[PDB]
Design a protein around this ligand. Structure first.
Ligand SMILES: O=C(c1ccc2ncccc2c1)c1c(Cl)cccc1Cl
Length: 320
């Protein structure tokens, strides 16, 4: 007993067992099947024509025969369209990406109890504000092929997968120290690549890793990163202090996107604060409410390595 969904690009079919898995009280694999068919029909206009109207209105998620009717109607339409293309990979849309990331998480994080995360910006609630906030950030930082993106404490890899699907960075890295999210990130990686192939969607190169970003190996790695992303909201003072030390080795124009600023927004250099990281970096608050945002009143911080802050203070002492 199983349900099969044919790929719009001829990849290996999506195979679901019956009874279908349940994700939570209001979310299950049946709704995922319905939403996948709908997204495929949205992106392929010919497919919508081929597929009968009623099929997506009258379905019973709790009926094997009903779900199988729904799956067969889609598959036949996939077959009709593949015969039409016989007679002679882009980036996913934002909408489709939200669906893919949720789908990848649903298939990967099978026991979310195991995460022990009660934080408001945790993997279990990613689609709520994070997806939209990360999307707002991608539009604001505007990375190129010369950039290398690192998420320090990447969890199950959701930020890395979103940025990789949206940008053209040389490479995207995610580093996670903790055992449980790092083991789930291995499945997230497999599922992401499988589903992206199924939809026929392109993504940048990315690596999800297990490791301590405060290690010796990661000192030179932070130093050579152009865009660092770090949710440092719960970070201790020692972790904060150590990170500032790693950031002090970054190149001019290097950027750090974070939840809490690493330097005051109103930092003013003087004879007493010359050790502070604020002497070598600009800091701005980016709030989607300032930048048609109707979500949570959230903000993130953009830091830019700029050693001219320090250079100017010295030139000012030498040239009054
Ligand atoms: O990680 C965050 C994030 C942001 C704000 C937060 N506010 C309070 C608590 C945690 C938080 C985490 C993030 C960042 Cl830094 C940039 C872009 C998109 C996202 Cl989702």
């Amino acid at each position: 007993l199983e349900l099969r969904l044919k790929s719009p690009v001829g990849a290996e079919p999506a195979v679901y067992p019956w009874p279908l898995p349940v994700y939570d009280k209001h979310h299950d694999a049946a709704h995922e099947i319905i939403e996948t068919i709908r997204w495929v029909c949205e992106e392929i206009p010919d497919l919508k024509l081929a597929m009968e109207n009623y099929v997506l209105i009258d379905y019973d998620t709790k009926s094997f025969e009903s779900m199988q009717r729904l799956c067969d109607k889609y598959n036949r339409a996939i077959d009709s369209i593949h015969q039409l293309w016989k007679g002679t990979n882009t980036r996913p849309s934002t909408g489709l990406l939200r669906h893919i990331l949720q789908q990848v998480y649903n298939h990967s994080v099978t026991d979310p109890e195991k995460l022990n995360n009660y934080e408001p910006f945790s993997p279990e609630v990613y689609g709520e504000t994070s997806f939209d906030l990360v999307a707002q950030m991608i539009d604001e930082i505007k990375m190129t092929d010369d950039d290398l993106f690192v998420d320090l404490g990447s969890g199950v890899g959701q930020v890395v997968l979103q940025v990789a699907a949206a940008t053209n960075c040389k490479h995207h890295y995610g580093v996670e120290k903790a055992d449980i999210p790092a083991k789930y990130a291995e499945t997230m990686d497999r599922e992401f690549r499988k589903w992206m192939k199924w939809y026929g969607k392109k993504h940048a190169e990315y690596t999800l890793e297990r490791g301590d970003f405060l290690s010796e190996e990661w000192r030179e790695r932070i130093a050579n990163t152009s865009v660092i992303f770090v949710n440092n909201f719960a970070f201790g003072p020692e972790v904060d202090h150590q990170l500032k030390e790693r950031f002090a080795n970054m190149k001019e124009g290097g950027r750090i996107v974070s939840s809490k600023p690493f330097a005051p927004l109103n930092f003013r250099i003087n004879s007493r604060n010359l050790s502070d990281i604020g002497t070598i970096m600009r800091v701005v608050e980016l709030s989607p409410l300032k930048g048609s945002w109707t979500g949570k009143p959230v903000s993130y911080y953009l830091h830019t390595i700029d050693r001219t802050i320090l250079e100017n203070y010295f030139s000012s002492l030498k040239n009054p």
